[PDB]
From a paper:
However, analyses of the formation of TF complexes on DNA have revealed that many TFs also bind together across the family boundaries, in a DNA-dependent or DNA-facilitated manner. Because the DNA-bound TFs are fixed at particular positions relative to each other, the contact surfaces required for cooperative DNA-facilitated binding are very small, and can evolve rapidly. We also generated an unseen test set by solving six structures that represent several TF–TF–DNA complexes bound to optimal DNA sequences. The structures included two BARHL2 homodimers with two spacings, HOXB13 homodimer and TEAD4–HOXB13, MEIS1–HOXB13 and FOXK1–ELF1 heterodimers.
Recently released versions of RoseTTAFold (RoseTTAFold2NA v.0.2)39 and AlphaFold (AlphaFold v.3.0), which can predict the structures of protein–nucleic acid complexes, performed much better in predicting the overall geometry of TF–TF–DNA complexes. However, only AlphaFold 3 was able to predict the structure of the HOXB13 homodimer.
Numbering used by the authors:
A (entry chain B): 216 to 277
B (entry chain J): 221 to 277
The structure:
DNA sequence: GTTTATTTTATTGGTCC
DNA sequence: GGACCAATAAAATACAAC
């Protein structure tokens, strides 16, 4: 377990949202572009989209 | 909105029983006090944070 | 100004090709 | 092996009551 969670930067988050608008699913090539461009882990990025996906589903509340 | 004192005592009763809670328990517990498993789940989640804030009671 | 409920990282364990 | 899902926790926030 452990792995104390760390709040991402607004800059990074913005770029994250930016691309998620383009595609809800991410290509193994964009991920490498996105990571380097935001200094994160591909695994982290995949986790973001992995999690971002569930957010949208929750908007079903609307 | 505030949870009942009796309900409260019920919670801490089980919380001393176990910091984390089995789904089997959440049942009895939610029904036992008519709550929401989300709610019961949420209390325990926030409950643990209290314990990390023990400052000589 | 102090004391329930939502949102955000993150791992775990199931699937499906 | 890689992608996806959901269940679940903890840290961080938020917002109401009091």
């Amino acid at each position: 377990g452990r792995k104390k969670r760390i709040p991402y930067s607004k800059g990074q988050l913005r770029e994250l949202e930016r691309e998620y608008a383009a595609n809800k699913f991410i290509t193994k090539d964009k991920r490498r572009k996105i990571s380097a461009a935001t200094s994160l882990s591909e695994r982290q990025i995949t986790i973001w989209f992995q999690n971002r996906r569930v957010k949208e589903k929750k908007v079903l509340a609307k």
